[PDB]
Amino acid sequence: GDLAGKWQLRQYQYADGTSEKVDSVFYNFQKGSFSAICLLKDGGLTTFFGNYSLKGAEISIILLPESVNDKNYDTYFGWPEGKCTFKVEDLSYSSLRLEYEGTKSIFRKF
């Protein structure tokens, strides 16, 4: 469907009203498999791996222990137990909007 493929995380809209552009994070969804490519300042490419499941308008992402133990885990995720359930505020073939505790993750299809 629309969720399948790669997504560039363009912006965070924080619960306190702050917005910040992101240009280094890419989420990928492929039939339950989740992966996130993060582009480091040093020209490096760090990838986190996990799974995702859907229930109504919610998406639960769970990262593998190895991704949770990654030295850059708190830079890009920092989720307790490598898990986060997001509200899908918007999904179309080109747009994705995820919400968790007032913070929005804004994506465009890549």
* DSSP character string of 20-78: EEEEEEEEEEETTEEEEEEE-TTS-EEEEEEEEEEETTEEEEEE-HHHHTSTTHHHHT-
Distances (CA, A) of 93 to 6, 21, 42, 59: 11, 21, 32, 16
Q: In whole angstroms, give the CA distance from residue 41 to residue 28.
A: 21
What single DSSP character describes residue 3? S
93-96: long-range contacts at Cβ-Cβ below 8 A with a sequence spacing of 24 or more?
A: 93/2, 96/3, 96/7
Task: Report resolution in angstroms.
Answer: 1.8
> Which residues touch 42 (CB under 8 Å, ≥6 apart)?
none
Strands 95-100 and 83-91: antiparallel
Determination technique used: X-ray
Task: Give me the phi and psi of 93, to 5 degrees please.
Answer: -60, -30
CATH 3.40.30.120 fits 1-110, yes or no: no
Task: Give me the phi and psi of 108, to 5 degrees please.
Answer: -125, 145
